């Protein structure tokens, strides 16, 4: 056992004597918190490591008590750093000022939240390995979010007004369900024995945002022959609206039970998210098949792009799709009928909190403003193909069935892989790439040497131009996507001609050709993407020439 007063004093002096970062960060944070210019404060346990490390272990063992102690210490320290009144004060601030002008619960007057960030020395755990030994401790978990609930208010402190007196009664809430009061415990009513009845007030009461979310284990950490396990996380305060379904997240929190069996849950404190044509250096050749993927990732200025690759088996189309899925920030990958029907579009499901029905989207909905990858496209069902066509042409999905009447926005770019032409793919897709294989001794020897080098050294063969990591590519793409070039008026007189003659050539080759305004739109989109790659405000001729060359190369694949 140990007295909490000494540790409270230690926390108070720590919050005031951490200049070793040169600006006094905590002084500024307290000033902003006192002037209502900041509503959240995070404490680093790595910062506490400079002080006595016993506090770190104590916090890791009894996190809630020390969180309350930190909150109390910050509340006591706030008056010292105050300099001025609130510039713009809201309804709650008006109530606080009026109450101070005229005991009150500490959380009622409090208007800030405190959270702990896990130490870097603390190794993250696994959802499967958190058990009774970790109950009440501070843990860090890495996982994937699958379900998120809507934001709703939750009571913190309830305020009651009496029928025959101006006294206000305050009731803290520490349970999922609470019993409202009836009689007035005020001293005036107690003396007079009037027996007045209390009435709840929504304005005086304090509310906080509340959210539910679910997390699952990564497929890498699953043991042999097992199935990933799920955990439930509660979100409150400013941490709300951070996590979204389909994201890989890391959450630091506390493991607590619910009432001799009990059910466990997690309370979140910190949630965090986890030439340039060098896509998949592991694959030899396909030099002209990689710039198209880069342009697809960059996108146009609707400016979406859809790409389909048809090829004989064994040319490794799937690896390119997997690399594209891994590289893109928001991406989804589909293999076939394992995610057909309900896997796409959306479905109606019960709520965890409200107890009513809400709509949860599929792969296409999750991939909104991202890139979707489809493998074995020819094997998909008719309904899925119609939905994909609707997404490609209209960018919205329309659902009208029993209990569902919705229009979902899906602004996603589709990359598809297929085996061996039907007119639908040519008329709908912007770019089709047909990959054919033929035996050549020199090319076979080169490919075999590259494959053997990859298998032996576990790394692609070195060359004059070294490739780049995924983080640098992502940052470069993010920087490139910022700008929006414009097509000059004069170049029209060029581009139109470049179109017309082309169609004339297509009219000469009556065997099998397809041209329309869609080809011109695709050329314009590719030219705009190429101009964006150069950060130029005005599209140049070289971008148009490169786009025309790429389109011709796509067309010349028989």
């Amino acid at each position: 056992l140990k007295d909490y007063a000494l540790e409270k004093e230690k926390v108070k002096k720590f919050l005031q004597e951490f200049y070793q970062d040169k600006q006094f960060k905590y002084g500024n944070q307290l000033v902003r918190l006192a002037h209502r210019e900041q509503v959240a404060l995070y404490v680093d346990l790595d910062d506490v490591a400079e002080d006595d490390p016993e506090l770190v272990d104590s916090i890791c063992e009894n996190a809630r008590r020390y969180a309350k102690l930190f909150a109390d210490a910050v509340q006591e320290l706030l008056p010292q750093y105050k300099e001025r009144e609130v510039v713009n004060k809201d309804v709650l601030d008006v109530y606080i000022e009026h109450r101070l002008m005229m005991q009150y619960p500490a959380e009622l007057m409090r208007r800030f939240e405190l959270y702990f960030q896990g130490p870097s020395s603390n190794k993250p755990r696994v959802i499967r390995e958190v058990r009774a030994d970790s109950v009440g401790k501070l843990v860090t978990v890495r996982g994937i979010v699958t379900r998120v609930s809507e934001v709703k208010p939750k009571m913190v402190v309830a305020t009651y007004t009496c029928d025959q007196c101006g006294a206000e009664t305050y009731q803290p809430i520490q349970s999922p369900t609470f019993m409202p009061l009836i009689m007035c415990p005020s001293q005036e009513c107690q003396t007079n024995r009037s027996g007045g009845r209390l009435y709840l007030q929504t304005r005086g009461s304090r509310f906080i945002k509340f959210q539910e979310m679910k997390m699952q284990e990564h497929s890498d950490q699953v043991p042999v022959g097992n199935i990933p396990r799920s955990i439930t996380v509660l979100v409150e305060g400013e941490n709300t609206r951070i996590a979204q379904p389909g994201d890989h997240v890391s959450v630091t929190g506390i493991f607590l039970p619910i009432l001799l069996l009990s059910e466990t849950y997690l309370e979140a404190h910190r949630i965090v998210k986890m030439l340039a044509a060098s896509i998949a250096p592991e694959i030899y050749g396909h030099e002209d098949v990689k710039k198209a993927l880069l342009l697809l990732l960059v996108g146009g200025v609707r400016g979406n792009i859809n790409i389909c690759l048809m090829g004989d088996p064994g040319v490794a189309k799937s690896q390119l799709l997997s690399y594209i899925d891994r590289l893109a920030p928001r991406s989804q990958y589909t293999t076939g009928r394992g995610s057909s029907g309900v896997g796409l579009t959306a479905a109606v499901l019960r709520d965890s909190v409200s107890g009513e029905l809400t709509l949860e989207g599929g792969a296409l909905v999750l991939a909104d403003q991202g890139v979707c990858c489809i493998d074995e496209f020819d094997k998909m069902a008719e309904a899925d193909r119609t939905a994909i066509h609707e997404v490609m042409e209209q960018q919205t999905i329309s659902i009208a069935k029993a209990g569902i009447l919705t229009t979902l926005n899906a602004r996603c770019s589709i990359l598809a892989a297929a085996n061996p032409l039907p007119a639908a793919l040519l008329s709908r897709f912007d770019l089709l790439w047909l990959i054919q294989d033929r035996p050549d001794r020199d090319n076979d020897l080169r490919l075999a040497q590259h494959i053997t080098y990859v298998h032996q050294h576990s790394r692609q063969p070195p060359s004059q131009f070294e490739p780049l990591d995924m983080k640098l590519m992502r940052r470069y793409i993010a920087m490139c996507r910022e700008k929006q070039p414009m097509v000059p008026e004069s170049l029209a007189d060029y581009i139109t001609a470049a179109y017309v003659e082309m169609r004339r050539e297509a009219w000469a080759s009556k065997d099998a050709t397809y041209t329309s305004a869609r080809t011109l739109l695709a050329i314009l989109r590719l030219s705009t993407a190429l101009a964006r790659l150069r950060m130029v405000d005005v599209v140049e001729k070289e971008d148009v020439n490169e786009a025309i060359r790429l389109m011709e190369m796509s067309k010349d694949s028989l």
């Binding site: 709703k152 909905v365 329309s398 097509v487």
Partner: protein, 623 residues
């Protein structure tokens, strides 16, 4: 005022009294200030109009209040519950001061509107509880009327005295002692001698159209009171101004324990129908305040010009090149035909609307036209291929959210009543789904007979359908019927069928390329007013000359279509012609149908199917 507020009753009352007399806007134009002298104060004229008519309700714009001052606007937004009665009493005092001897039913009430529009409902916070909020959405469910008690009537068992109690704070305290015989617990409540008010529950579907990445649509619940009940219908797009509420949820009905998490709730105080982009609705068309005399004169002068018809076809969609015939057909559909009544004849309802089918290659702008029509016309619905089921349309069985009321729920087609339904990828639709359309396109009614439910619903809907050839290409060797592959019964119900083909003209390609590249670098209000005035004023009628012309056109059409390979003609087609003629009568603002309208309808029908270029004896089209 209650503790925790800075609102002062007297100051707000004086400020509102001054504002009702001092506010003048010079930027206001006669385009919206109908029947009001702009030089004179506006709200005083509104009060005078109220006195003349007798409507006990006044509409006040929040933007005008903000323009006058910011303190009053902020106080009204923050604390509506205290501000609104002050405004009501100030308005009542001013009205009774200026206009003695007036006769009404109750005191005048004020309804604010056009507050700051929240971009998304999900962006709200508990800080916004009990504040004025404006929403835009579409109604999908409306419940029945619910009575809510306001006063309670009590009667004594022994002496039978009459007493009344008024509700305070939402709770009624029944007396425990009498007033004449002083007997304890001798008072009994009588429900039928009490006073009740109407309450209605409505459901909105939110669509701000600027949703973030991965956000699904939202459903909101609204509660309406008093005269606001039944002011909206399912499928209508409305703006709702009201208050935000939070209500606790009981753990169970018979235990007073409640959950810590509260339930969101919205109270409705104002409805708005007008939109800056969409056409006028049916509610506005039943009023005389829509059009000022100057605009009526301008529209009448414009209608006299001969080219205005074509001008309208030029102004329908400037973002799509040419396609004059398609735009003319869309305009004629928008105008519609005469809605005759055949109840005395026994024939039943007669379809006065036009259904249009467009067939062509996938590389065509038919989808753009469908999207533009859907976005432009109110009460419009959109479906795509197999995404909709036969049960998804019409209605389906669903229980009431509380009890077993067996509440039938409307579908896409029913929500399209008096509107437009667009269908894309009409080929993929199954025969079961087309079975519904078979009845809908002709009878304009839907008959539902399932377990415990037997009913008929109105389905006055006009359909725009899009279709494709077999191989996504128009094969010249195959005939039109072979390429389309649709049953003759289904095709016969379409008034106009537009076949879109590619002639591969160099000038056409150059023009299309120039227009597409230039895309990178008439007034709509005038069009809306003209369409509304034409649709809500004139009922065309046809004469003997039009009769003979229609008979000759019908016999000529039958002779032309007798040949195999082409789409055959049926008597139903004749009716279509009449409808088209009536539409033309609405274009020229003429109450009499002349031979010119019949000739134009015949020309449009002939050009739509490309019969002139089509070989009459082989069914192969070659320009």
């Amino acid at each position: 005022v209650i503790w925790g507020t800075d609102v002062n009753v007297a100051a707000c009352k004086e400020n509102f009294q001054r504002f009702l007399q001092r506010f003048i806007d010079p930027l206001a134009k006669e385009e919206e200030n109908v029947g009001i002298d702009i030089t004179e104060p506006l709200y005083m004229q509104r009060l005078g109009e109220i006195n003349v008519i007798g409507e006990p309700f006044l509409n006040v714009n929040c933007e005008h209040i903000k323009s006058f001052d910011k303190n009053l606007y902020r106080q009204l937004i923050s604390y509506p519950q205290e501000v609104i009665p002050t405004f009501d009493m100030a308005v009542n005092e001013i009205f009774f001061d200026r206009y003695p001897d007036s006769i009404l039913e109750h005191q005048i009430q004020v309804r604010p509107f056009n507050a700051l529009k929240t971009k998304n409902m999900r962006n709200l916070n508990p800080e916004d509880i009990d504040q004025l909020i404006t929403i835009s959405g579409m109604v999908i469910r409306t419940s029945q009327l619910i009575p809510e008690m306001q006063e309670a009537f009590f009667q004594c068992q022994v002496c039978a005295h009459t007493t009344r109690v008024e509700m305070d704070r939402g709770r009624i305290a029944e007396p425990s002692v009498c007033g004449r015989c002083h007997t304890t617990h001798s008072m009994a409540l009588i429900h039928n001698r009490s006073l009740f008010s109407d309450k209605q529950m409505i459901k909105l579907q939110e669509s701000p159209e600027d949703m973030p990445a991965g956000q699904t649509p939202h459903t909101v619940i609204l509660f309406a009171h008093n005269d606001l009940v039944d002011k909206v219908q399912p499928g209508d797009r409305v703006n709702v101004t009201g208050i935000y509420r939070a209500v606790p949820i009981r753990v169970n009905p018979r235990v007073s324990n409640v959950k810590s998490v509260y339930k969101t709730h919205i109270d409705v105080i104002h409805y708005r129908k007008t939109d800056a982009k969409r056409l006028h609705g049916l509610d506005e068309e039943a009023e005389q305040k829509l059009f000022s005399e100057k605009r009526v004169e301008l529209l009448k002068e414009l209608s006299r010009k001969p080219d205005i018809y074509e001008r309208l076809a030029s102004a329908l969609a400037p973002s799509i090149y040419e396609h004059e015939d398609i735009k003319k057909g869309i305009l004629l559909q928008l105008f519609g035909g005469t809605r005759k009544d055949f109840s005395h004849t026994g024939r039943g309802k007669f379809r006065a609307e036009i259904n249009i089918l467009l067939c062509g290659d996938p590389g065509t702008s038919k989808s753009q036209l469908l999207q533009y029509v859907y976005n432009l016309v109110p009460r419009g619905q959109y479906t795509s291929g197999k995404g909709s089921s036969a049960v998804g349309l019409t209605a389906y069985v669903m229980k009431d959210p509380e009890t077993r009321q067996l509440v039938l729920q409307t579908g896409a087609l029913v929500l399209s009543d008096n509107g437009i339904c667009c269908i894309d990828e009409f080929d993929k639709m199954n025969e079961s789904t087309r079975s519904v359309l078979h009845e809908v396109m002709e009878q304009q009614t839907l008959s539902i007979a399932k377990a415990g439910i037997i009913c008929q619903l109105n389905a006055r809907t006009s359909v725009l359908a899009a279709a494709n050839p077999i191989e996504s290409q128009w094969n010249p060797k195959k005939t039109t019927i072979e390429n389309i592959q649709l049953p003759h019964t289904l095709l016969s119900r379409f008034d106009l069928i537009f076949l879109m083909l590619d002639p591969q003209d160099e000038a056409y390609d150059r023009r299309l390329a120039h227009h597409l590249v230039a895309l990178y670098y008439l007034d709509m209000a005038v069009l809306k007013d003209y369409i509304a005035y034409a649709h809500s004023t004139i009922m065309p009628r046809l004469s003997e000359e039009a009769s003979q012309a229609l008979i000759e056109a019908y016999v000529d059409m039958r002779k032309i279509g007798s040949s195999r390979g082409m789409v055959s003609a049926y008597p139903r087609q004749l009716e279509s012609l009449i409808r088209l003629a009536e539409a033309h009568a609405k274009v020229r603002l003429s109450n009499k149908v002349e031979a010119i309208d019949v000739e134009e309808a015949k020309r449009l029908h002939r050009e739509a199917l490309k019969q002139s270029a089509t070989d009459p004896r082989t069914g192969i089209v070659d320009i």
